[PDB]
Amino acid sequence: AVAYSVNHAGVAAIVLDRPEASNALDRTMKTELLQALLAAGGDPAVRAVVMSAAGKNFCVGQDLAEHVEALRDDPAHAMDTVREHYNPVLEALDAIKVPVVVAINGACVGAGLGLALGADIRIAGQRAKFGTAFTGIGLAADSALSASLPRLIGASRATAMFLLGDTIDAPTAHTWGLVHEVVDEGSPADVANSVAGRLAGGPTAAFSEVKELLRRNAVAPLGDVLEREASAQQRLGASRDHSAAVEAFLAKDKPVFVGR
Amino acid sequence: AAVAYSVNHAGVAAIVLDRPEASNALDRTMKTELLQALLAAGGDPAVRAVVMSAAGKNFCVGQDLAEHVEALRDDPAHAMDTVREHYNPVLEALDAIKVPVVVAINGACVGAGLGLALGADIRIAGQRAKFGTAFTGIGLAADSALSASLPRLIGASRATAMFLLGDTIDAPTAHTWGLVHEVVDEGSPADVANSVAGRLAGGPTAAFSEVKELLRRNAVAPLGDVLEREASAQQRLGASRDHSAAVEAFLAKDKPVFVGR
Amino acid sequence: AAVAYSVNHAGVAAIVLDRPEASNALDRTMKTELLQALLAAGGDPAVRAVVMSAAGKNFCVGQDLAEHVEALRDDPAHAMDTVREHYNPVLEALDAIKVPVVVAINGACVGAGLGLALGADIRIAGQRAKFGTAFTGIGLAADSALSASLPRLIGASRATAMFLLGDTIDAPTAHTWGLVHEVVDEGSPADVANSVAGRLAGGPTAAFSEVKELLRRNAVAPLGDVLEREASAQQRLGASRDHSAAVEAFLAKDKPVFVGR
């Protein structure tokens, strides 16, 4: 239901594989997704992660039928899944230190959007549609979407998407900063795999450091920004990948990077 | 009188700046009445959405000139007491409104007028709207939360340019920059703002209040806090009447009817 | 000699990178002299604006390669000492300047050169200016505050692509993204920057300093703190000479002269 593999080049592939339900997230999906993300995060050989999905739609979020059962069974506790399933998935995704690429086809809504916005690089097919969804069904937000959406497109457009509840299309998402590239529908997994392959061959420690600097320094005082930068640069200055790159540059030559 | 207040049958509170002869310049009367209207809208359980608009050609030119001149001649050291006394409670009252706030912006929107407009959630601009900080043009800095609201909407760089260079920007620029959500024909901002408020007033009001609070609280929060707050908000709403109604509507592939609880 | 410093008649401090033969690559001499120029500018009470520019075709290609190679071969474990010893004080010194800072960007602006440029308030680029982070290209991450300043200017998505994929952008992309305020003909950026700096220098310098500090303090502050700080700053400016001058001049349909207090 969620496929996981790590190839020779150290690219971990996580594929949502429930296309008949538009990759709607039932307990089986949520459990296997968590496992896939934790494995990617805990494997020292993984130098990049690519997240993709089978069928026409990336992820429509929570499985409706499973939600109906919980709601009819115990309405005061029907959102237990947020703590039990969604939160650890988002934390597992966040814990991944290497670059994460996502290939977004068709519908990407609710927790599906939440999952996608947790990646570092986002590639959309031309017919991709992005939506908060939660307020449409009288809910607010989960899957970190109340933070990740405004941080990518700003508070004003995030607020509009949540209150008006309308889907936006791929070009609008590109213009707004929600995704990095728009490609032909059916091509985003191929492009994401190439981008992930390219990242996996790069200086993995440098990528992990800069990713962490970016997260920590978003709103920090300048003094803290500069101190953390200095320390990260000192660690990388001593890395094998840094000497290899400098030596390659002097030799008018292309470096091979190994991630340390 | 100077600020008109009413609440319709749909639960839309309408707030109208009604001093068009002075381009809705904020004197003591305007400020005191604006506060009362905002507090009334914020405290009324029946209000499901708020719409802010302005009579005449211009939305709001900010602080009343004559009145400020009197204060400045009378006592230069205390000429800006009104910021604490009037503008700050106004911005807190607007911020305290839990439900969606929509504003129709026509013509000049500058100074405290701009601060007021940027406190709204959805901003609808007329073709001939003009936005400007105005403060440094007369040797002041900023009030009406504009030193936070502007950079949060258009980014630090463009906000810094508006404040330092005193650049006024037009409607399509404001749109592209993210200062307003839509640009329509001049004269229409009110009508479009009213439709939008009406639409939002018919939506899941408890969910709208929750998500607005989540967006505000989670802007720079650690992930663990973001996720905990989201879990709690969803659990509160999972027990709402609107959520059950929406679930059974979705099962039939209908759009739900919402009552706001 | 490596960095030129002067303060003109109008209180404009000019800082010019003047190692054109090396595309203004920052070696120890250059870094030390840049720090002294920024400290002089920040501590001089006659200074009312700052303009940063560079001789030759390229603004600044960042760290000097030859000096870096020598440190790396001598002692790899400490090869980045310079970040703490040189770059960090430079960025703090730039940040400590209270008055407006304008930068003119010709040609290549990469690495620490980009960091330096993004610490300015107003950025004017020539048509052939190019911007890149460069660090990960050689297995480093970030310095010169770029892990903060870049995403704060262009957003998290674009900054992440620049850092991770090594995407280099040209002037019109930079303009659309909000990385620079203006693109002019190559070989006009310093001219335009000087005009802008000159206009800012003749402006209400105390007001400019207050609003810049308000913008920085209030970026992520709670509304109560935002409003309190705005009121205090407005009260201080309300009693300034420049503010009275502005108001008297507007009443007499006349241009005001500002002295910065």
Side-chain angles (χ1 to χ4, degrees), chain A residues 67 76-80 83 87 91 94 135-146 151 156-157 163-164 166, chain B residues 123 175-176 181 199-200 204 207-208 211 215 218-221 223 227-228 230-232 234-235 243 247 250 258:
Chain A
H67 181 73
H77 300 128
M79 314 305 306
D80 275 352
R83 285 180 210 282
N87 291 356
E91 293 203 292
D94 178 81
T135 56
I137 206 171
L139 303 178
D142 62 57
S143 304
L145 197 62
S146 72
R151 285 174 197 174
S156 193
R157 289 159 174 171
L163 300 187
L164 302 175
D166 288 311
Chain B
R123 285 165 289 277
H175 192 232
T176 295
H181 296 86
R199 172 177 167 174
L200 291 164
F208 287 155
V211 80
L215 288 164
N218 289 340
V220 300
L223 182 60
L227 295 181
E228 161 72 46
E230 286 175 347
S232 293
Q234 299 297 64
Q235 197 82 290
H243 174 61
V247 172
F250 274 45
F258 290 123

Tab-separated table of all heavy atoms in Angstrom, chain A residues 67 76-80 83 87 91 94 135-146 151 156-157 163-164 166, chain B residues 123 175-176 181 199-200 204 207-208 211 215 218-221 223 227-228 230-232 234-235 243 247 250 258:
chain	number	residue	atom	x	y	z
A	67	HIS	N	-13.205	7.489	8.302
A	67	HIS	CA	-13.608	8.597	9.136
A	67	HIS	C	-15.080	8.532	9.551
A	67	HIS	O	-15.418	8.862	10.683
A	67	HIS	CB	-13.345	9.935	8.452
A	67	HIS	CG	-13.736	11.087	9.303
A	67	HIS	ND1	-13.010	11.469	10.410
A	67	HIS	CD2	-14.838	11.867	9.286
A	67	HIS	CE1	-13.621	12.477	11.004
A	67	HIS	NE2	-14.732	12.736	10.339
A	76	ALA	N	-16.930	12.424	19.848
A	76	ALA	CA	-16.024	13.169	20.705
A	76	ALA	C	-14.565	12.714	20.555
A	76	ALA	O	-13.659	13.400	21.042
A	76	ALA	CB	-16.464	13.043	22.160
A	77	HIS	N	-14.336	11.560	19.915
A	77	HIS	CA	-12.977	11.026	19.751
A	77	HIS	C	-12.617	10.644	18.322
A	77	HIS	O	-11.651	9.916	18.104
A	77	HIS	CB	-12.767	9.825	20.674
A	77	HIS	CG	-12.927	10.149	22.128
A	77	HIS	ND1	-13.751	9.430	22.969
A	77	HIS	CD2	-12.370	11.120	22.890
A	77	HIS	CE1	-13.692	9.939	24.187
A	77	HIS	NE2	-12.861	10.967	24.165
A	78	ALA	N	-13.357	11.169	17.347
A	78	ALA	CA	-13.192	10.752	15.956
A	78	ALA	C	-11.897	11.259	15.321
A	78	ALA	O	-11.492	10.763	14.265
A	78	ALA	CB	-14.384	11.195	15.131
A	79	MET	N	-11.265	12.245	15.960
A	79	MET	CA	-10.009	12.802	15.489
A	79	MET	C	-8.792	12.275	16.251
A	79	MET	O	-7.729	12.869	16.187
A	79	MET	CB	-10.043	14.326	15.563
A	79	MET	CG	-11.299	14.966	15.015
A	79	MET	SD	-11.693	14.499	13.329
A	79	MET	CE	-10.205	14.858	12.395
A	80	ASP	N	-8.945	11.166	16.965
A	80	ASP	CA	-7.807	10.469	17.586
A	80	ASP	C	-6.673	10.228	16.579
A	80	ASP	O	-5.494	10.288	16.937
A	80	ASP	CB	-8.244	9.114	18.180
A	80	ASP	CG	-8.807	9.232	19.598
A	80	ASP	OD1	-8.740	10.316	20.210
A	80	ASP	OD2	-9.314	8.219	20.114
A	83	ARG	N	-3.429	12.593	16.438
A	83	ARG	CA	-2.343	12.280	17.379
A	83	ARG	C	-1.702	10.914	17.126
A	83	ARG	O	-0.483	10.758	17.219
A	83	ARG	CB	-2.855	12.318	18.823
A	83	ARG	CG	-3.084	13.716	19.345
A	83	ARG	CD	-3.596	13.704	20.772
A	83	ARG	NE	-4.435	14.872	20.998
A	83	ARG	CZ	-3.970	16.094	21.213
A	83	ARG	NH1	-2.659	16.316	21.278
A	83	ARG	NH2	-4.824	17.095	21.396
A	87	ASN	N	0.362	13.119	13.229
A	87	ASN	CA	1.453	13.816	13.885
A	87	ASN	C	2.788	13.064	13.795
A	87	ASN	O	3.785	13.668	13.414
A	87	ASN	CB	1.069	14.202	15.317
A	87	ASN	CG	-0.007	15.284	15.349
A	87	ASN	OD1	-0.410	15.804	14.301
A	87	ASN	ND2	-0.462	15.644	16.543
A	91	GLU	N	6.179	14.417	11.910
A	91	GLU	CA	7.441	14.463	12.642
A	91	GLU	C	8.514	13.588	11.997
A	91	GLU	O	9.673	13.978	11.949
A	91	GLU	CB	7.232	14.117	14.129
A	91	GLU	CG	6.409	15.195	14.823
A	91	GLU	CD	6.591	15.248	16.314
A	91	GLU	OE1	6.157	14.291	16.999
A	91	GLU	OE2	7.144	16.266	16.808
A	94	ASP	N	9.733	15.398	8.975
A	94	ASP	CA	10.589	16.492	9.443
A	94	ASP	C	11.965	16.017	9.933
A	94	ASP	O	12.960	16.728	9.767
A	94	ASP	CB	9.882	17.265	10.554
A	94	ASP	CG	10.730	18.382	11.126
A	94	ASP	OD1	10.793	19.469	10.524
A	94	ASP	OD2	11.323	18.182	12.200
A	135	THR	N	-11.756	23.034	5.905
A	135	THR	CA	-12.922	23.880	6.227
A	135	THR	C	-14.161	23.516	5.424
A	135	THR	O	-15.284	23.731	5.886
A	135	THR	CB	-12.624	25.369	6.053
A	135	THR	OG1	-12.158	25.611	4.722
A	135	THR	CG2	-11.567	25.810	7.058
A	136	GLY	N	-13.950	22.946	4.235
A	136	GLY	CA	-15.025	22.379	3.435
A	136	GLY	C	-15.871	21.372	4.193
A	136	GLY	O	-17.070	21.289	3.977
A	137	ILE	N	-15.247	20.622	5.101
A	137	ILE	CA	-15.943	19.623	5.902
A	137	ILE	C	-16.069	20.068	7.378
A	137	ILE	O	-16.259	19.254	8.272
A	137	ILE	CB	-15.258	18.238	5.730
A	137	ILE	CG1	-16.234	17.086	5.995
A	137	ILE	CG2	-14.020	18.092	6.601
A	137	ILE	CD1	-15.661	15.736	5.620
A	138	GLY	N	-15.976	21.374	7.621
A	138	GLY	CA	-16.202	21.936	8.956
A	138	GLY	C	-15.100	21.695	9.967
A	138	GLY	O	-15.338	21.762	11.177
A	139	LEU	N	-13.895	21.407	9.476
A	139	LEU	CA	-12.705	21.270	10.318
A	139	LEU	C	-11.766	22.437	10.008
A	139	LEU	O	-12.083	23.274	9.169
A	139	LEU	CB	-12.022	19.932	10.052
A	139	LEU	CG	-12.888	18.688	10.264
A	139	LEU	CD1	-12.107	17.427	9.913
A	139	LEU	CD2	-13.410	18.613	11.697
A	140	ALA	N	-10.623	22.501	10.682
A	140	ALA	CA	-9.702	23.636	10.559
A	140	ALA	C	-8.414	23.249	9.828
A	140	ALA	O	-8.190	23.668	8.682
A	140	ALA	CB	-9.379	24.187	11.939
A	141	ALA	N	-7.569	22.456	10.491
A	141	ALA	CA	-6.259	22.092	9.953
A	141	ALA	C	-5.597	20.991	10.761
A	141	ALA	O	-5.754	20.916	11.982
A	141	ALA	CB	-5.342	23.309	9.901
A	142	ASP	N	-4.861	20.132	10.061
A	142	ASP	CA	-3.922	19.219	10.698
A	142	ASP	C	-2.800	18.892	9.694
A	142	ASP	O	-2.735	19.506	8.634
A	142	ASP	CB	-4.639	17.981	11.267
A	142	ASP	CG	-5.331	17.145	10.205
A	142	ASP	OD1	-4.651	16.689	9.247
A	142	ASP	OD2	-6.557	16.915	10.353
A	143	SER	N	-1.907	17.969	10.044
A	143	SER	CA	-0.761	17.630	9.197
A	143	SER	C	0.185	18.827	8.960
A	143	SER	O	0.829	18.941	7.906
A	143	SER	CB	-1.246	17.005	7.878
A	143	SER	OG	-2.063	15.877	8.161
A	144	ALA	N	0.247	19.698	9.967
A	144	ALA	CA	1.115	20.870	10.012
A	144	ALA	C	0.771	21.968	8.993
A	144	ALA	O	1.517	22.942	8.843
A	144	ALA	CB	2.584	20.450	9.894
A	145	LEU	N	-0.379	21.836	8.347
A	145	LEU	CA	-0.759	22.715	7.246
A	145	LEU	C	-0.981	24.159	7.686
A	145	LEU	O	-0.773	25.090	6.898
A	145	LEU	CB	-2.016	22.181	6.561
A	145	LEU	CG	-2.292	22.754	5.178
A	145	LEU	CD1	-1.182	22.432	4.181
A	145	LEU	CD2	-3.627	22.207	4.702
A	146	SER	N	-1.374	24.338	8.949
A	146	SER	CA	-1.578	25.664	9.515
A	146	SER	C	-0.261	26.432	9.700
A	146	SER	O	-0.293	27.625	9.929
A	146	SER	CB	-2.354	25.580	10.840
A	146	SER	OG	-1.569	25.042	11.896
A	151	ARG	N	3.890	29.563	5.527
A	151	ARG	CA	5.334	29.746	5.467
A	151	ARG	C	5.830	29.646	4.039
A	151	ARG	O	6.903	30.162	3.726
A	151	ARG	CB	6.067	28.748	6.371
A	151	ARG	CG	5.981	29.087	7.866
A	151	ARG	CD	6.608	27.991	8.747
A	151	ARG	NE	6.192	28.102	10.147
A	151	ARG	CZ	6.486	27.234	11.118
A	151	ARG	NH1	7.230	26.162	10.869
A	151	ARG	NH2	6.029	27.440	12.355
A	156	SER	N	-1.452	35.836	4.026
A	156	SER	CA	-2.625	36.310	3.304
A	156	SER	C	-3.228	35.283	2.338
A	156	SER	O	-4.433	35.063	2.351
A	156	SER	CB	-2.315	37.572	2.535
A	156	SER	OG	-3.538	38.136	2.105
A	157	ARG	N	-2.407	34.671	1.489
A	157	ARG	CA	-2.934	33.686	0.536
A	157	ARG	C	-3.289	32.350	1.201
A	157	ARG	O	-4.223	31.665	0.768
A	157	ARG	CB	-1.964	33.494	-0.622
A	157	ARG	CG	-1.934	34.709	-1.538
A	157	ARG	CD	-0.669	34.762	-2.367
A	157	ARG	NE	-0.719	35.857	-3.337
A	157	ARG	CZ	0.308	36.251	-4.079
A	157	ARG	NH1	1.488	35.650	-3.959
A	157	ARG	NH2	0.161	37.261	-4.936
A	163	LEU	N	-10.128	29.949	4.245
A	163	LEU	CA	-11.463	30.542	4.388
A	163	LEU	C	-12.363	30.375	3.162
A	163	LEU	O	-13.532	30.019	3.296
A	163	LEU	CB	-11.357	32.029	4.739
A	163	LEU	CG	-10.611	32.313	6.037
A	163	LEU	CD1	-10.707	33.787	6.370
A	163	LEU	CD2	-11.147	31.457	7.174
A	164	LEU	N	-11.834	30.642	1.975
A	164	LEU	CA	-12.620	30.484	0.747
A	164	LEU	C	-12.712	29.020	0.335
A	164	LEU	O	-13.722	28.578	-0.211
A	164	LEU	CB	-12.039	31.323	-0.384
A	164	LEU	CG	-11.959	32.822	-0.079
A	164	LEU	CD1	-11.257	33.571	-1.205
A	164	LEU	CD2	-13.345	33.392	0.153
A	166	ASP	N	-11.132	27.290	-1.925
A	166	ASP	CA	-10.983	26.914	-3.319
A	166	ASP	C	-9.600	26.375	-3.621
A	166	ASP	O	-8.585	26.874	-3.131
A	166	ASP	CB	-11.319	28.076	-4.257
A	166	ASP	CG	-12.815	28.369	-4.300
A	166	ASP	OD1	-13.609	27.408	-4.480
A	166	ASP	OD2	-13.190	29.549	-4.119
B	123	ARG	N	-9.057	41.187	1.509
B	123	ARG	CA	-8.964	42.562	1.042
B	123	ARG	C	-9.359	42.600	-0.426
B	123	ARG	O	-8.769	41.900	-1.256
B	123	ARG	CB	-7.543	43.107	1.234
B	123	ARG	CG	-7.208	43.436	2.685
B	123	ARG	CD	-5.714	43.634	2.914
B	123	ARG	NE	-5.013	42.365	2.820
B	123	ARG	CZ	-4.902	41.483	3.807
B	123	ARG	NH1	-5.420	41.731	5.001
B	123	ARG	NH2	-4.258	40.344	3.594
B	175	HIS	N	-2.056	43.785	-5.789
B	175	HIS	CA	-2.538	42.441	-6.065
B	175	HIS	C	-1.373	41.485	-6.279
B	175	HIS	O	-1.296	40.439	-5.636
B	175	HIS	CB	-3.434	42.459	-7.301
B	175	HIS	CG	-4.200	41.191	-7.516
B	175	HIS	ND1	-4.193	40.511	-8.715
B	175	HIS	CD2	-4.995	40.480	-6.684
B	175	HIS	CE1	-4.958	39.438	-8.615
B	175	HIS	NE2	-5.456	39.395	-7.391
B	176	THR	N	-0.460	41.864	-7.167
B	176	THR	CA	0.689	41.035	-7.508
B	176	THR	C	1.621	40.856	-6.310
B	176	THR	O	2.225	39.800	-6.140
B	176	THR	CB	1.468	41.640	-8.699
B	176	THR	OG1	0.641	41.606	-9.869
B	176	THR	CG2	2.764	40.869	-8.979
B	181	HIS	N	-6.320	40.636	-2.145
B	181	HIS	CA	-6.652	39.349	-2.770
B	181	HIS	C	-7.265	39.489	-4.169
B	181	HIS	O	-7.073	38.615	-5.014
B	181	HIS	CB	-7.582	38.537	-1.860
B	181	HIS	CG	-6.947	38.145	-0.558
B	181	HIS	ND1	-6.941	38.970	0.546
B	181	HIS	CD2	-6.278	37.026	-0.190
B	181	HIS	CE1	-6.305	38.377	1.538
B	181	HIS	NE2	-5.889	37.196	1.117
B	199	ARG	N	-20.940	34.926	1.795
B	199	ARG	CA	-20.499	33.550	1.592
B	199	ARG	C	-19.826	33.002	2.853
B	199	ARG	O	-20.135	31.893	3.299
B	199	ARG	CB	-19.550	33.478	0.393
B	199	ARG	CG	-18.858	32.140	0.191
B	199	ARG	CD	-18.005	32.174	-1.065
B	199	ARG	NE	-17.085	31.042	-1.138
B	199	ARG	CZ	-16.301	30.767	-2.181
B	199	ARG	NH1	-16.320	31.538	-3.266
B	199	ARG	NH2	-15.491	29.713	-2.144
B	200	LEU	N	-18.915	33.784	3.424
B	200	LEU	CA	-18.187	33.376	4.625
B	200	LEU	C	-19.095	33.278	5.842
B	200	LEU	O	-18.882	32.422	6.707
B	200	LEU	CB	-17.050	34.350	4.927
B	200	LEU	CG	-15.876	34.331	3.950
B	200	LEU	CD1	-15.031	35.584	4.117
B	200	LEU	CD2	-15.015	33.088	4.134
B	204	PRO	N	-18.743	27.358	7.882
B	204	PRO	CA	-18.562	26.752	9.201
B	204	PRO	C	-17.820	27.689	10.166
B	204	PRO	O	-16.603	27.579	10.351
B	204	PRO	CB	-17.753	25.493	8.889
B	204	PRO	CG	-16.951	25.855	7.676
B	204	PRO	CD	-17.741	26.879	6.909
B	207	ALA	N	-15.254	26.497	12.730
B	207	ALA	CA	-14.027	26.064	12.044
B	207	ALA	C	-13.192	27.259	11.589
B	207	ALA	O	-11.973	27.264	11.752
B	207	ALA	CB	-14.354	25.155	10.862
B	208	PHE	N	-13.848	28.268	11.035
B	208	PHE	CA	-13.151	29.500	10.612
B	208	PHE	C	-12.426	30.195	11.782
B	208	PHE	O	-11.279	30.620	11.638
B	208	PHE	CB	-14.121	30.503	9.951
B	208	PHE	CG	-14.580	30.128	8.557
B	208	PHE	CD1	-15.798	30.610	8.080
B	208	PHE	CD2	-13.815	29.331	7.713
B	208	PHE	CE1	-16.237	30.302	6.801
B	208	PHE	CE2	-14.249	29.024	6.436
B	208	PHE	CZ	-15.464	29.506	5.981
B	211	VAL	N	-9.329	27.898	12.758
B	211	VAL	CA	-8.205	27.908	11.816
B	211	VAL	C	-7.485	29.274	11.794
B	211	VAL	O	-6.260	29.346	11.681
B	211	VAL	CB	-8.629	27.474	10.396
B	211	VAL	CG1	-9.296	28.614	9.637
B	211	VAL	CG2	-7.416	26.970	9.624
B	215	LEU	N	-3.564	29.590	12.472
B	215	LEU	CA	-2.667	30.358	11.594
B	215	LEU	C	-1.868	31.417	12.362
B	215	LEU	O	-0.660	31.543	12.190
B	215	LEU	CB	-3.462	31.019	10.463
B	215	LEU	CG	-4.002	30.094	9.372
B	215	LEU	CD1	-5.077	30.792	8.549
B	215	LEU	CD2	-2.883	29.611	8.464
B	218	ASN	N	0.542	29.537	15.053
B	218	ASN	CA	1.527	28.597	14.522
B	218	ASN	C	2.526	29.182	13.542
B	218	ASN	O	3.390	28.463	13.045
B	218	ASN	CB	0.812	27.381	13.914
B	218	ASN	CG	0.184	26.502	14.979
B	218	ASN	OD1	0.570	26.571	16.137
B	218	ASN	ND2	-0.774	25.681	14.594
B	219	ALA	N	2.439	30.484	13.285
B	219	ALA	CA	3.278	31.110	12.257
B	219	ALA	C	4.763	30.808	12.432
B	219	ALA	O	5.430	30.458	11.457
B	219	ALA	CB	3.037	32.615	12.207
B	220	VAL	N	5.274	30.925	13.661
B	220	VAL	CA	6.689	30.640	13.927
B	220	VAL	C	6.912	29.608	15.040
B	220	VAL	O	7.993	29.551	15.637
B	220	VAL	CB	7.482	31.934	14.236
B	220	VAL	CG1	7.402	32.891	13.059
B	220	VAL	CG2	6.974	32.609	15.500
B	221	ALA	N	5.915	28.765	15.292
B	221	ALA	CA	5.996	27.812	16.397
B	221	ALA	C	6.781	26.544	16.019
B	221	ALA	O	6.803	26.140	14.858
B	221	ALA	CB	4.601	27.445	16.872
B	223	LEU	N	7.438	22.626	15.536
B	223	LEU	CA	6.537	21.650	14.934
B	223	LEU	C	5.648	20.939	15.968
B	223	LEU	O	4.469	20.749	15.730
B	223	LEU	CB	7.345	20.608	14.157
B	223	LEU	CG	6.525	19.543	13.422
B	223	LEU	CD1	5.593	20.180	12.395
B	223	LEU	CD2	7.442	18.536	12.756
B	227	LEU	N	1.564	20.766	15.862
B	227	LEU	CA	0.825	19.514	15.745
B	227	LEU	C	-0.142	19.261	16.918
B	227	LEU	O	-1.255	18.763	16.708
B	227	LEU	CB	1.812	18.347	15.579
B	227	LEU	CG	2.658	18.363	14.285
B	227	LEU	CD1	3.591	17.158	14.212
B	227	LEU	CD2	1.784	18.416	13.034
B	228	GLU	N	0.280	19.608	18.133
B	228	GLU	CA	-0.585	19.508	19.314
B	228	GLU	C	-1.813	20.417	19.196
B	228	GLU	O	-2.937	19.987	19.471
B	228	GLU	CB	0.206	19.826	20.598
B	228	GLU	CG	-0.628	20.206	21.828
B	228	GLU	CD	-1.400	19.041	22.453
B	228	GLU	OE1	-0.797	17.941	22.636
B	228	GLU	OE2	-2.609	19.227	22.790
B	230	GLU	N	-3.097	21.701	16.455
B	230	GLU	CA	-3.934	21.185	15.379
B	230	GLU	C	-4.804	20.016	15.854
B	230	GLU	O	-6.009	20.017	15.622
B	230	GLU	CB	-3.085	20.780	14.161
B	230	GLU	CG	-2.568	21.974	13.375
B	230	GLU	CD	-1.636	21.592	12.249
B	230	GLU	OE1	-1.169	20.431	12.208
B	230	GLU	OE2	-1.378	22.464	11.395
B	231	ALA	N	-4.201	19.049	16.543
B	231	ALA	CA	-4.946	17.896	17.082
B	231	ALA	C	-6.133	18.313	17.974
B	231	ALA	O	-7.238	17.795	17.825
B	231	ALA	CB	-4.014	16.975	17.844
B	232	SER	N	-5.892	19.257	18.880
B	232	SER	CA	-6.919	19.754	19.792
B	232	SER	C	-8.042	20.480	19.078
B	232	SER	O	-9.209	20.298	19.419
B	232	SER	CB	-6.303	20.701	20.817
B	232	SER	OG	-5.431	19.985	21.672
B	234	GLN	N	-8.950	20.137	15.854
B	234	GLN	CA	-9.712	19.157	15.091
B	234	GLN	C	-10.664	18.386	16.011
B	234	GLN	O	-11.826	18.186	15.659
B	234	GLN	CB	-8.789	18.182	14.346
B	234	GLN	CG	-7.845	18.809	13.325
B	234	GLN	CD	-8.563	19.498	12.177
B	234	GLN	OE1	-9.282	20.477	12.367
B	234	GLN	NE2	-8.357	18.993	10.976
B	235	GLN	N	-10.188	17.983	17.189
B	235	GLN	CA	-11.022	17.205	18.122
B	235	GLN	C	-12.229	18.035	18.599
B	235	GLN	O	-13.354	17.535	18.617
B	235	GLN	CB	-10.195	16.668	19.306
B	235	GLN	CG	-10.855	15.532	20.104
B	235	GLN	CD	-10.682	14.122	19.475
B	235	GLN	OE1	-11.273	13.809	18.421
B	235	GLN	NE2	-9.900	13.249	20.158
B	243	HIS	N	-19.705	19.846	11.429
B	243	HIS	CA	-18.860	18.785	10.902
B	243	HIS	C	-19.659	17.528	10.581
B	243	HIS	O	-19.432	16.890	9.553
B	243	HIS	CB	-17.738	18.448	11.868
B	243	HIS	CG	-16.935	17.267	11.442
B	243	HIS	ND1	-16.236	17.230	10.255
B	243	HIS	CD2	-16.745	16.067	12.030
B	243	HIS	CE1	-15.642	16.056	10.137
B	243	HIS	NE2	-15.932	15.337	11.205
B	247	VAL	N	-20.214	15.916	6.873
B	247	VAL	CA	-19.878	14.531	6.582
B	247	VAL	C	-21.043	13.856	5.860
B	247	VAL	O	-20.825	13.191	4.850
B	247	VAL	CB	-19.486	13.736	7.842
B	247	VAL	CG1	-19.337	12.258	7.516
B	247	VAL	CG2	-18.181	14.273	8.433
B	250	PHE	N	-21.252	15.249	2.337
B	250	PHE	CA	-20.185	14.643	1.506
B	250	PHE	C	-20.514	13.220	1.042
B	250	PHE	O	-20.177	12.836	-0.075
B	250	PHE	CB	-18.845	14.601	2.265
B	250	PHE	CG	-18.020	15.859	2.146
B	250	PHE	CD1	-18.599	17.120	2.290
B	250	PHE	CD2	-16.653	15.780	1.903
B	250	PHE	CE1	-17.832	18.275	2.186
B	250	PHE	CE2	-15.881	16.931	1.804
B	250	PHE	CZ	-16.472	18.180	1.946
B	258	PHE	N	-24.264	25.048	6.639
B	258	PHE	CA	-23.556	25.300	7.896
B	258	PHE	C	-24.323	26.302	8.762
B	258	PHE	O	-24.863	27.274	8.241
B	258	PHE	CB	-22.169	25.868	7.594
B	258	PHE	CG	-21.202	24.877	6.986
B	258	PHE	CD1	-20.599	25.135	5.769
B	258	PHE	CD2	-20.859	23.719	7.656
B	258	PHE	CE1	-19.685	24.245	5.227
B	258	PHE	CE2	-19.951	22.822	7.119
B	258	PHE	CZ	-19.361	23.086	5.904
